[PDB]
Paper text:
To gain structural insights into a putative complex formed by FtsH and YidC, we performed single-particle cryogenic electron microscopy on detergent-solubilized membrane samples, from which FtsH and YidC were purified using Ni–NTA affinity and size-exclusion chromatography. Although SDS–PAGE analysis indicated high purity of these proteins, cryo-EM data sets unexpectedly yielded high-resolution structures of ArnA and AcrB at 4.0 and 2.9 Å resolution, respectively. ArnA is a bifunctional enzyme involved in lipid A modification and polymyxin resistance, while AcrB is a multidrug efflux transporter of the AcrAB–TolC system. ArnA and AcrB, known Ni–NTA purification contaminants, were also consistently detected by mass spectrometry in Strep-Tactin affinity-purified samples, validating their presence independently of affinity-tag selection.
AcrB is a key component of the AcrAB–TolC multidrug efflux system, responsible for exporting diverse substrates across the bacterial envelope. Structurally, AcrB functions as a homotrimeric multidrug efflux pump that undergoes a conformational cycling mechanism, with each protomer adopting one of three alternating states: access (loose), binding (tight) or extrusion (open). This asymmetric arrangement enables unidirectional substrate transport. In the present model, the trimeric architecture and domain organization are consistent with this established mechanism. While the global fold aligns well with the reference structure, local differences were identified, particularly in flexible loop regions and surface-exposed side chains. Notable deviations were observed between Asp711 and Glu693, which reside within the PN2 subdomain of the T protomer.
Numbering used by the authors:
A (entry chain B): 51 to 197
B (entry chain B): 592 to 936
C (entry chain A): 198 to 247
D (entry chain B): 445 to 493
E (entry chain B): 248 to 345
F (entry chain C): 51 to 148
The structure:
């Protein structure tokens, strides 16, 4: 729900200010988008084993955590290690076509996301849909009527 | 969908399926960007040189230029997804004085216009950032809200829950925990006018509209912001002119870096930083290999003059490699270098 | 007056609030505009703080 | 021959940067092969001949 | 039947009278299609050190084993794959070696 | 707070996908008891360095520590290495009995 101004001025600045003392940090770059996303990439020197760098980055994020707003804390901050763009993409389709894309996405998320992480050699998995969530769509007219 | 239709009907014998994704993009992630993967058939069913991916991409982008509304680029994957386009660079402007946002964009525009006056040295010098876009600006009158008796926290949570959504708690559907969201109806958050359609309850049982104590206007602003090393930055791409080395463009780039307004510094990121950090070590490595080879040869033989007879045979083998490379139209890449190495060996 | 009132007033009127978007997902068919919304911004001057 | 080939191929492995990896790959894959081939030609072939 | 308010005359207005409750998604900003037909892919990222041929055959076996636990009409396609390329390249290299 | 089914579905099913970023990994198994205690054991292959695995488990559970509700923040989890044999047990007694 926030623009670039809010996400930069409430999320990015605290993390940038509380991220000193990391060894063998070559450079960094932070991007803030109008949709409400903040992405910070820290690139280290060649040949450095990545696990200790990841754990140090996570430790600094843990130190900076309490200063962030409540909503971003509830959503969840993610720290990982980047890799190649895409290795392979598997799509799920249905010939019947009687039902919408949300059903396919929720099925793939609920019954396949956990299983794919099991095989060794997969850094992370991103999904091209949304998992089922129960939505309450308001109507202002009833709110007017019943106060 | 027009891309999908064109690919499936004018390229039936070359492409097998098209996977079209909307809302991901590569330069941004908003609602105005999209990508599409295209896979070809089996290689056994595509004879000739007119069915290669290179022979497909330029036909696609030539036939797609007729649309004057959108910007569509069709290409094929780089050999390594991490780094590429060595002849290019990733020059960056950094703010070192806390000037603001308009000043940085104005400096970038000045640099772009002033670099546009060197067409024989710089080619395709373009930014990879999105220009400023309009947005809505709504101001709540604190004094009026206090006078009417509506708390500011209530107004903020009402607006946020209505037009931004809100995560409340979790529940179990079929043995799994799933989230619960609260949001206004789609047909009630499209236009500015229905800003006045929301009512807020006051202390003394009175409903007041938003427009009673609010104002709004339009303002231009950036939708994607970039910071380098903790300071605001604007990244600019570019390419070297054909027939000219990047080192020749480096002195030009620093000469252009020298005449910018105060408080605007420069930096290099990405492959440009790697190129600067690597330094000039290839000639020194060649010299040390030359010396080691001389010493080893003089060790194998006895006299100091005999090794020269073997040592000065290099150009005879080198001439063939360059002749073949010029005849075919090759490029000086790693395979060519190791070919020279094994031939001299 | 009391210091608690001062702290409450400072907390309430120096906060950043998200206001959502115009024409966000899921959209209604036949829409031609899509822009962000600005609600509030933290103070940036001593006179503004006064 | 073995020492000359080692002297001409080994120093490429010492290149730094991202290109250093794909250079050391080739340098090792030729140096090891040459070192083994010289030894094999020294030991095995005379008996077979 | 989530109780919201009773007013003064015992109206008993529930959540379904003031809003519509359904089961959708948290976000709607990404939509994918495969020759026009709706679909939902799965982006996979490789680790720093991992096999190409391996770690993929296990995926195939797992998908085959989970095939019975699928509704009718549900199938999988591969709009992006690299394994055949490495296979043919290795085959060509060994062919020219022999 | 959570009964058998709720604590069954809210902890292990959510932290299931968190366990991805550790190589040489075999499995994980979770138990939940009526007293209010949950225990999840993670097993790797014989030869991985234990400390890096433990710290990786911690920084990867930090992925969904915010994702789970606030109830998991307050209680406080304990993650550590676990053996299977008591090294030695020393008891203390009072002959006085007072």
């Amino acid at each position: 729900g926030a623009d670039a101004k809010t996400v930069q001025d409430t999320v990015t600045q605290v993390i940038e200010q509380n991220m000193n003392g990391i060894d063998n940090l070559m450079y960094m770059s932070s991007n803030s988008d109008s949709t409400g996303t903040v992405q910070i990439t820290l690139t280290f020197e060649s040949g450095t084993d990545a696990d200790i760098a990841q754990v140090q980055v996570q430790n600094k994020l843990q130190l900076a955590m309490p200063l962030l707003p409540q909503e971003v804390q509830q959503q969840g901050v993610s720290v990982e290690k980047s890799s190649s763009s895409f290795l392979m993409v598997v799509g799920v389709i249905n010939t019947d076509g009687t039902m919408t894309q949300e059903d396919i996405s929720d099925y793939v998320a609920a019954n396949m996301k956990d299983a794919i992480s099991r095989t060794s050699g997969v850094g992370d998995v991103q999904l091209f849909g949304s998992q089922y969530a129960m939505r309450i769509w308001m109507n202002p007219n009833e709110l007017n009527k019943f106060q | 969908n027009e891309v999908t239709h064109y690919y499936l009907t004018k390229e039936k014998n070359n492409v097998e399926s098209v996977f079209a994704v909307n809302g991901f993009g590569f330069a941004g992630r908003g609602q105005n960007t999209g990508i599409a993967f295209v896979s070809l058939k089996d290689w056994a069913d595509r004879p000739g040189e007119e069915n290669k991916v290179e022979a497909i991409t330029m036909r696609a982008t030539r036939a797609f230029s007729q649309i004057k509304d959108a910007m569509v680029f069709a290409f094929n994957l780089p050999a390594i997804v991490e780094l590429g386009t060595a002849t290019g660079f990733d020059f960056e402007l950094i703010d070192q004085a806390g000037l603001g946002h308009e000043k940085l964009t104005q400096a970038r525009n000045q640099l772009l216009a002033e670099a546009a006056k060197h067409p024989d040295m710089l080619t395709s010098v373009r930014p990879n950032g999105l220009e400023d876009t309009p947005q809505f600006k709504i101001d709540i009158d604190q004094e009026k809200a206090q006078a009417l008796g509506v708390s500011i926290n209530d107004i903020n949570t009402t607006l946020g829950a209505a037009w931004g959504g809100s995560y409340v708690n979790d529940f179990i559907d079929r043995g799994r925990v799933k989230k619960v969201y609260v949001m206004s109806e789609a047909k009630y958050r499209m236009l500015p006018d229905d800003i006045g359609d929301w009512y807020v309850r006051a202390a003394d049982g009175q409903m007041v509209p938003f427009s009673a104590f609010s104002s709004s206007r339009w303002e231009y602003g950036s939708p994607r912001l970039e910071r380098y090393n903790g300071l605001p930055s604007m990244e600019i791409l570019g390419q070297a002119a054909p027939g000219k080395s990047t080192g020749e463009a480096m002195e030009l780039m620093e000469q252009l870096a020298s005449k910018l307004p105060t408080g605007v510094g420069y930096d290099w990121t990405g492959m440009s930083y790697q190129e600067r950090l690597s330094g000039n070590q290839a000639p020194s490595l060649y010299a040390i290999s030359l010396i080691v080879v001389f010493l080893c040869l003089a060790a194998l033989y006895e006299s100091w003059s005999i090794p020269f007879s073997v040592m000065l045979v290099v150009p005879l083998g080198v001439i063939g490699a360059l002749l073949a490379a010029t005849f075919r139209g090759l490029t000086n890449d790693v395979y060519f270098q190791v070919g020279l190495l094994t031939t001299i060996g | 007056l009391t210091p608690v009132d001062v702290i409450t007033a400072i907390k309430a009127q120096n906060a950043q609030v998200a206001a959502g978007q115009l024409g966000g997902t899921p959209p209604v068919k036949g829409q031609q505009l899509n822009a962000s919304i600005i609600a509030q911004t933290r103070l940036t001057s001593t006179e503004e703080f006064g | 021959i073995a020492m000359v080939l080692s002297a001409v191929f080994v120093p490429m492995a010492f290149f730094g940067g991202s290109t250093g990896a794909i250079y050391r790959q080739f340098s090792i894959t030729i140096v090891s092969a040459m070192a083994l081939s010289v030894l094999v030609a020294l030991i095995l072939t005379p008996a077979l001949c | 039947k989530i109780l919201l308010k009773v007013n003064q005359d015992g109206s008993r207005v529930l959540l379904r009278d003031v809003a519509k409750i359904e089961l959708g998604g948290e976000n709607y900003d990404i939509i994918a299609e495969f020759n026009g037909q709706p679909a939902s892919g799965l982006g996979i990222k490789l680790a720093t050190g991992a096999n190409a041929l391996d770690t993929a055959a296990a995926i195939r076996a797992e998908l085959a084993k989970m095939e019975p636990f699928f509704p009718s009409g549900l199938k999988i396609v591969y709009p992006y794959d690299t394994t055949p390329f490495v296979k043919i390249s290795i085959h060509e290299v060994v062919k020219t070696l022999v």
